[PDB]
Write a protein that binds this ligand. Structure first.
Ligand SMILES: [Cl-]
Ligand SMILES: [Mn+2]
Ligand SMILES: [Zn+2]
Length: 654
């Protein structure tokens, strides 16, 4: 039993009750998964594993979620439970590498209490010494746990991560595992946020990626759909898998902004007002504008510390002694220097000592004990800077967000927003909200982002909007409403660079991403095709260095170029490598300073994706030096010494 789509084959063995995935390669196939068992329900702590094969219907010519393609419907039965499983797989004639999966269960004479449903499980075929993994979970750890994780098959440990999305985790419902020959992405096939895990688990000689959802009681005689997923078989690294997921999710209406609709100002070099921490003043910021303008900065963020309280989002009298006229003198000064002005906020936070909470507690999430629920950190808990959660289904909560947007734009003259330091949304038990279930607040969190952004756009279609779920992958369902992504408080060059590639994969090759400013890593920012930002008040050689790198970024403008993620595979090509095409020229960035993947010795640099019949001069555009005088496009291999990074362009020779 088999179905085919563009670049993928799926086979089912009725005896073993296993699925095997293949991808196309040249005129053949590469096996991507081992024969993998179908996912089952978990009852009393145990996966049910007495399912037997009933039937497998292949339809070679049909139309599904992704349009025309093929379908395989597998029916199985469990004598012990009375459950009949229907497992549906769909392929697409057009969508490369993608398999859509949906499962339902029917109960027999007795109700069945399921604690969890394992949807699909794929163990990688052909792994050797390591597997690289993309982990979209929102459970933390915050900041210092890499989203990209190496699963070492030669060490003592066994990698295991759940990758959760729930009331304490709001990130990206996707995981990928890959090797030299490519990999397998699994992601939640839902147009809206729901509770899901995409676990990544090392096995005896490989690793497996899976997806699953919370259980429920299946009433006797009833049929229920328990969850739907996309799988992507792909060559190369996580970028190819994540791009497949992006393409798949278009069919569910989760559509990221098209290049033509992204505002110019979302590609601009930006400085953010942290030069004095919480001790910024309006005049300190204004005092920097002449030098920032001269050096090529076109955008300014008024960062944290400007407001009385979250929720209220009123001007702090200490920072704005003259009220709104002070906010205006700030944004006017910014505008007079040819720049746009952004304002920091924390969406979903209604404060604790806010007027908002005092006057309108009914707008807030209520916990199971009847108390106001705090906004959670990743994996649970809160922190002192996070207030009470606004319930996304309370009209007054949403209106308070819209009113802030309108005030900041129309009264204070701001041109956009930097949302930050918020993660998931607690479950709500307020009976006045008439929730379908308590998880409804969590599921609808993204409504706050959507409605806020729609209000922003009504004031100015070129408004900037960014949300940093700091130290975690961004809330996937916020992504449609953004004009720029930050890599989100990365704590290393490895984190910032590898995340640029992930977000490009999910958002589009022209979608603006910034490498952020947690540490000074100008070469990382430029070479990945990211927007270079900064927050420090610099002097001496550090100031010179910023000016230098602004100059470079403003010359090559790779932030506006077409990111190319499919030529090099992170962890398998000799260097951590990034590629951008800008104004018809190929730019390459090779790094060795990322301790998570850095070569022994001095491997040759290979430039991929050039015209095989053309000759190129390879120019280090940072130092303005030729590193290779003439390479043919079909053998663009050279060796040059560099300690940390090499940023080059391939200039065609005529
Ligand atoms: Cl990472
Ligand atoms: Mn291991
Ligand atoms: Zn509520």
């Amino acid at each position: 039993y088999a179905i085919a789509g563009n670049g993928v084959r799926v086979t089912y063995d009725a005896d073993g009750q296993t699925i095997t995935l293949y991808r196309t390669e040249g005129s053949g196939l590469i096996q991507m998964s081992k024969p993998s068992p179908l996912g089952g329900p978990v009852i009393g702590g145990q996966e049910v594993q007495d399912f037997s094969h009933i039937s497998c219907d292949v339809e070679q010519s049909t139309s599904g979620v992704m349009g025309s393609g093929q379908r395989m419907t597998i029916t199985s039965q469990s004598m012990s439970t009375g459950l009949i499983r229907t497992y549906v797989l769909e392929t697409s004639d057009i969508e490369e590498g993608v398999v859509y999966t949906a499962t339902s269960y029917e109960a027999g004479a007795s109700d069945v209490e399921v604690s969890w449903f394992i949807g699909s499980v794929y163990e990688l075929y052909g792994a050797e010494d390591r597997i690289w993994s993309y982990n979209g979970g929102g459970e933390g750890p915050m900041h210092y746990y890499d989203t990209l994780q190496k699963i070492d098959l030669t060490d003592s440990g066994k990698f295991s991560r759940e990758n959760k999305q729930d009331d304490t985790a709001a990130s990206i419902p996707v995981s990928d595992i890959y090797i030299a020959d490519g990999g397998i992405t699994v992601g939640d096939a839902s147009a809206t946020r729901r509770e899901v895990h995409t676990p990544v688990q090392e096995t005896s000689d490989s690793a497996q990626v899976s997806i699953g959802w919370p259980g429920k009681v299946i009433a006797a005689g009833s049929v229920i759909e328990i969850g739907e997923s996309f799988a992507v078989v792909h060559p190369g690294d996580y970028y190819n898998g994540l791009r497949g997921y992006k393409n798949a999710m278009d069919h569910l209406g989760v559509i990221m902004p098209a290049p033509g609709d992204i505002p110019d100002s979302s590609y601009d070099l930006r400085w953010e007002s942290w030069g004095w921490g919480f001790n910024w003043t309006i005049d300190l910021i204004i005092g920097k504008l002449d030098e920032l303008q001269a050096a090529g900065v076109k955008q300014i963020t008024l960062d944290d510390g400007w407001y009385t309280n979250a929720g209220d989002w009123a001007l702090n009298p200490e920072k704005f002694p003259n009220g709104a006229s002070d906010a205006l003198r700030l944004t006017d000064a910014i505008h007079e220097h040819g720049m746009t002005a952004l304002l920091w906020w924390r969406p979903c936070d209604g404060g604790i000592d806010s007027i908002l909470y005092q006057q309108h507690p009914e707008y807030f999430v209520m916990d199971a004990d009847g108390r106001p629920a705090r906004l959670p950190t990743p994996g649970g808990g809160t922190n002192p800077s996070l207030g009470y959660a606004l319930c996304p289904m309370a009209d007054g909560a949403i209106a308070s967000q819209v009113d802030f947007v309108n005030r900041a734009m129309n009264d204070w003259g701001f041109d956009g927003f930097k949302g930050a330091y918020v993660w998931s949304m607690p479950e709500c038990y307020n009976p006045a909200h008439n929730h379908a279930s308590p998880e409804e607040s969590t599921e609808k969190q993204s409504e706050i982002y959507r409605v806020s952004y729609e209000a922003m756009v009504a004031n100015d279609p070129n408004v900037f909007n960014l949300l940093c779920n700091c130290g975690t992958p961004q809330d996937y369902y916020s992504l449609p409403y953004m004009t720029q992504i930050a890599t989100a408080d990365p704590t290393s060059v490895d984190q910032t660079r590898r995340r640029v590639k992930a977000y490009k994969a999910l958002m589009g090759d022209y979608f603006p991403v910034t490498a952020d400013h947690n540490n000074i890593w100008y070469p990382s920012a430029v070479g990945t095709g990211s927007v270079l930002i900064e927050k420090r008040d610099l002097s001496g050689t550090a100031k010179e260095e910023y000016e230098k790198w602004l100059g470079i970024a403003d010359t090559v403008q790779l932030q506006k170029g077409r990111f190319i993620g499919d030529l090099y595979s992170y962890g398998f090509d000799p260097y951590e490598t990034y590629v951008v095409a800008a104004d018809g020229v190929m730019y390459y960035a090779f790094y060795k300073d990322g301790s998570k993947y850095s070569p022994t010795g001095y491997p040759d640099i290979e430039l991929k994706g050039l015209d095989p019949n053309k000759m190129y001069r390879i120019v280090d555009y940072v130092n303005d030096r030729v590193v290779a005088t003439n390479l043919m496009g079909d053998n663009a291999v050279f060796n040059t010494r560099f300690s940390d990074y090499l940023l080059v362009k391939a200039v065609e020779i005529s």
